[PDB]
Design a protein around this nucleic acid. Structure first.
Lengths: 82, 85
DNA sequence: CACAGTGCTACAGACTGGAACAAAAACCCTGCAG
């Protein structure tokens, strides 16, 4: 009664093309939007804490500081080797 | 210890040592040693630590994170651990 | 089977002491050897 002529995009996508793409990419969910998205949280705080702050320079120093946040070289240090 | 104090462990070692060093002396050490116990910090007094956490807005876990880092690398840890804060 | 945390809790781990054991390090030695 609820699926006669209508199906949500995802229910179809998840019931149809999943085995195929898992066969092809080798895996999925590692490729998820999550690794992006989450980052958005930072973009908010880096727009307050670390912002300049004026419209001109703001994107510049957010972007820079973000890049610095992402780098491995630093995280290596912050592990403190156990 | 029994004849002149009775259980005062700290001082007997302290007074012989500071002064014994400044016997064949370059001074350099006298500053580090005279600061060493009661005044002040050595490392940093826990009140100064507490203030430098609370007032710069460091998350507890964030603070401890830093503490671990500064301790492990070239330490000689400076900051005081959380439970003493 | 998102992931970096979220503080305070829990008590896991880090400590002494003599009493004595053992192993190992690197000397000296004496032993039996050309």
């Amino acid at each position: 009664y609820r699926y006669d002529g209508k199906i949500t995009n995802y229910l179809h996508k998840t019931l149809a093309h999943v085995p195929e793409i898992v066969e092809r990419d080798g895996s999925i969910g590692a490729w998820a939007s999550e690794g992006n998205e989450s980052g958005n949280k930072l973009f908010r705080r880096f727009r307050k804490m670390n912002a300049r702050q004026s419209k001109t320079f703001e994107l510049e120093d957010i972007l820079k500081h973000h890049w610095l946040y992402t780098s491995k070289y630093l995280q290596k240090f912050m592990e403190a080797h156990k | 210890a029994e004849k002149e104090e009775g259980g005062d462990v700290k001082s007997v070692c302290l007074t012989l040592f500071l002064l014994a060093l400044r016997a064949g002396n370059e001074h350099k050490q006298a500053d580090e040693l005279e600061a060493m116990m009661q005044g002040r910090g050595f490392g940093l007094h826990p009140a100064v630590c507490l203030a430098i956490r609370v007032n710069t807005f460091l998350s507890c876990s964030q603070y401890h994170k830093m503490y671990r880092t500064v301790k492990a690398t070239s330490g000689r840890q400076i900051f005081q651990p959380l439970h003493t804060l």
